[PDB]
Design a protein around this ligand. Structure first.
Ligand SMILES: [Mg+2]
Ligand code: NA
Lengths: 321, 321
């Protein structure tokens, strides 16, 4: 096949460093799709990006047809077929500015995407706060299907499969129908009321339901910090892997298996429209199709509404644009 | 297939962080072969290793069948089918001084592999100084075959492929029959007299000894310092990648192509027996076969003898022990 173009921001950072090499290896679009990597980061981080590119070249990857490097979003995004917006401001400063400084960045870049990117582009926002950055980008590109901006919930989703695999003693790969609702945050609702496992209901097998409110939910949400405390650095490799899973799956197909994906609300489940909210989906033909009419019980929906308010608190905070 | 056990030392380090995930993903032994990771690092690195293992779990890899974590070599190595010795003493200290620091580690680990590994374990030394650690390791494993101890030169081979590909303007994946002789260091000799791109002869195409002598050899030789110049950290990721190339070619084969490995000399090309020295090989059915009868010209002979002088000298300093 001819090459596809992948834009990746925050090219000099840790998530990028785990990401770029599996991308060049064919992990993202497949073992037979060449790719061309187009890389943004700050003016002062250009030298470091070159350093990363010298390392990519030194891997001799068959599929890497070319690399572009630049501090200009408009160049970074030209003819981009996928864009991974990994770069973002970290808080260093109250929830007030984290939210504000990132709006700048994500209006600018969505502006640029809508101006130059392939009309057919798949956007995935990784930079925290993922959902709202996404929303700001989507909003900033009236010309591209709103359905093309997603935020990464797949790391929360994957973290929860490991908690479940462990608990049930069952093989992580043999878990179907798991769901994660809401914000990429401590607030997301990891939902297994439907999960199976190589035959059996996960409620059945585990039952407990206290391990659930008490251990499970909050372990999955405090996982990022648990990783920092142990190694003193954030989880770039698991985050890059989930970004790969999210995009691979989106493009290539999910096979009726459910995956969780932050995508613009249509209106279901109690979520306002045009809101980037994690909900389960099935992927096929380069498209995601939501999983519908799931019974939403009492507990489940107080959690769904709690995360869905953090979001509105987030939205209405940047809304002045 | 049953799970193959792959031991990895220096597990909380930088190379490791860019290598464990690719291994878990299938990249080292194939997409149809499950693995068990056995990880070693210092006692006060145990918490950092658990961190990385948490992240590993959070990737939900189907090929990842189990994980062992430990600060005990005999534990890390028990039943190991592949052992990647990545950890080593960093410099900070005179060389004579760093050689013995490291010999002290590889005598311990070489004896550990000797006592507990599978009889057929494949060992790749990645940590520096690679050839001399491999050698010490093998001398301490009197009961495992000498042919299963190797040092990594593949990052040199791979760095020379990109240099060539840039100069000749040919695609890297098209380059063939390149050899890199000697020590994993700047005294190494990347030799393209036999190399072909698409079929044309490289030495023909490039026809420039000035370029060869003045840019090429020392660009390939000093590359790692250039990565640090640009990036501020060392070339962890492309190192992880050549390790995977090294091992994967070794086990799965090269299908007739040449690749460089640091192997124990059989006395060919005028290298004294058992010194670990890079030479070109071809892999099939889990073994390598030296490429022989190559013509060594006088410039080449001088280079190959310069890198042999350095290996004799390194070993001469760890001789006792
Ligand atoms: Mg080759
Ligand atoms: Na370490």
């Amino acid at each position: 096949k001819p090459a596809k173009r992948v834009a990746v921001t925050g090219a000099a950072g840790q998530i990028a460093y785990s990401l770029l090499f599996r991308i060049a290896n064919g992990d993202l679009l497949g073992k037979d799709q060449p790719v061309i990597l187009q890389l943004l980061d700050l003016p002062q981080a250009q030298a470091a990006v070159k350093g990363v590119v010298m390392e990519l070249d030194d891997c001799a990857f068959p599929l890497l047809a070319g690399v572009v490097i630049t501090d200009d979003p408009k160049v970074a995004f030209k003819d981009a077929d996928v864009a991974l917006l990994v770069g973002a401001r970290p808080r260093s400063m109250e929830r007030k500015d984290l939210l504000s400084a990132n709006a700048e960045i994500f209006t600018v870049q969505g502006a640029a995407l809508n101006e130059v990117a392939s009309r057919d582009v798949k956007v995935l926002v990784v930079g925290n706060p993922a959902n709202t950055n996404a929303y700001i980008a989507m909003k900033s590109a009236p010309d591209l299907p709103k359905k093309n901006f997603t935020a990464m919930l797949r790391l929360d989703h994957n973290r929860a499969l490991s908690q479940l695999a462990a608990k049930s003693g069952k093989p992580v790969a043999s878990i179907e129908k798991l769901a994660v609702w809401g914000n990429h945050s401590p607030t997301m609702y990891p939902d297994f009321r439907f999960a199976t496992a190589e035959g059996e209901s996960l409620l059945k097998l585990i039952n407990d339901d206290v391990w659930n409110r008490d251990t499970f939910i909050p372990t999955v949400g405090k996982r990022g910090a648990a990783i920092i405390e142990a190694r003193g650095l954030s989880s770039a490799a698991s985050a890059a892997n989930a970004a790969i899973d999210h995009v691979r799956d989106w493009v290539l197909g999910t096979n009726g298996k459910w995956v969780t994906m932050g995508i613009p609300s249509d209106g279901s489940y109690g979520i306002p429209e045009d809101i980037i909210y994690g909900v389960p989906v099935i992927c096929e033909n380069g498209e995601y199709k939501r999983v519908e009419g799931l019974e939403i019980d009492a507990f489940s929906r107080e959690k769904m509404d709690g995360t869905l308010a953090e979001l509105l608190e987030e939205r209405d905070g940047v809304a002045h644009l």
